[PDB]
């Protein structure tokens, strides 16, 4: 990894870190609501440990 | 929208042993492999998880024996092997 590659990798990684995404918000605040609702309509109830 | 096929999913009849191939060598391992391959998993992606597992098979009796035909037939076979003639013909019979 010469210097040019080193910066390139760094730029790519920080690009991945910086891009906005709603996925974490959906998981923490929205997904549990959907799971709770769906858990009551299937014939087979959820089996968990 | 409200597709029943996605809501009424339950195990099919004869589920625990349906995929078992007919063999006598290692029925439980063979059945386990058949289930794994049937489910769409490929060995190269399951990795070490595929080596030791075993699953129930039709070739295995409830008592834990290797069977090649339904157990009733086995009962029938031994029963038929012993059927003395009901009426015999001998000179001294009164």
UniProtKB/Swiss-Prot annotation, chain B:
Its protein name is Inner capsid protein VP3
Instruction: Please give the family membership noted in the entry.
Output: Belongs to the turreted BTV-fold inner capsid family.
Q: Assembly and interactions?
A: Homodecamer; each decamer is made up of two conformers of VP2, called VP2A and VP2B. 12 homodecamers assemble to form an icosahedral capsid. Interacts with VP6.
| Location in the cell | Virion
UniProt organism field: Aquareovirus C (isolate Golden shiner/USA/GSRV/1977) (AQRV-C)
Highest taxon of the lineage = Viruses
Query: Which intervals carry biased composition (Low complexity)?
Result: 16-39
Extract the ranges annotated as region (Disordered).
1-68
- Purpose: Inner capsid protein that self-assembles to form an icosahedral capsid with a T=2 symmetry, which consists of 120 copies of VP2, with channels at each of its five-fold vertices. This capsid constitutes the innermost concentric layer of the viral mature particle.
Whichever gene encodes this chain, its name is: S3
């Amino acid at each position: 990894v010469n210097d040019l590659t080193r910066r390139t990798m760094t730029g790519v990684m920080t690009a991945m870190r910086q891009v906005k995404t709603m996925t974490p918000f959906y998981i923490q605040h929205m997904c549990p609501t959907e799971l709770s609702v769906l858990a009551s309509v299937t014939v087979t109830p959820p089996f968990q440990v | 929208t409200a597709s029943p096929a996605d809501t009424n999913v339950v195990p099919a009849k004869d589920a625990p042993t349906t995929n078992s191939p007919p063999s006598t060598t290692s029925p439980n391992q063979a059945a386990a492999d058949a289930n794994q391959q049937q489910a769409g998993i490929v060995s190269s992606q399951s990795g070490p998880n595929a080596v030791g597992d075993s699953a129930p098979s039709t070739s295995v009796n409830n008592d834990g024996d290797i069977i090649t035909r339904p157990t009733s037939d086995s009962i029938a076979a031994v029963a038929n092997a012993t059927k003395p003639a009901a009426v015999v013909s001998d000179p001294q019979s009164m």
